[PDB]
Design a protein around this ligand. Structure first.
Ligand SMILES: [Cu+2]
Length: 123
């Protein structure tokens, strides 16, 4: 099935956000990213996607449909606003093997704080 995500300049958690920021899906599902405001895109983060999944990067302002195949956790960012915290976590299948690794990886402090919130309060 399909899960729709919006990219906004301002939302429930503050400025520059993906809503929802926690996406639960299964292999074969699609995630459709819709920039409701301009200036946003979606890009997989290096070493924060599962082992055999392909990297991806959309163009700014375009609607992008991601098909997810490999199970595991994926942290995606908005390229321009990553440093301002704009990320989302996609969890494919149950108990994603790489989730603790992604939570521990090096990333901006603001990113880390939002990630921690979404895993607690968004799961
Ligand atoms: Cu953005």
């Amino acid at each position: 099935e399909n899960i729709e995500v919006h990219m906004l300049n301002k939302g429930a958690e503050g400025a520059m956000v993906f809503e929802p920021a926690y996406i639960k899906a299964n292999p074969g599902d699609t995630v459709t990213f819709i920039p409701v405001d301009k200036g946003h895109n979606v890009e997989s983060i290096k070493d924060m996607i599962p082992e055999g999944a392909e990297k991806f990067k959309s163009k700014i302002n375009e609607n992008y449909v991601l098909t997810v195949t490999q199970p595991g956790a994926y942290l995606v960012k908005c390229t321009p606003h990553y440093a301002m915290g704009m990320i989302a976590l996609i969890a494919v299948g149950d108990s994603p093997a790489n989730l603790d690794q992604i939570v521990s990886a090096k990333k901006p402090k603001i990113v880390q704080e939002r990630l921690e919130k979404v895993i607690a309060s968004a799961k």
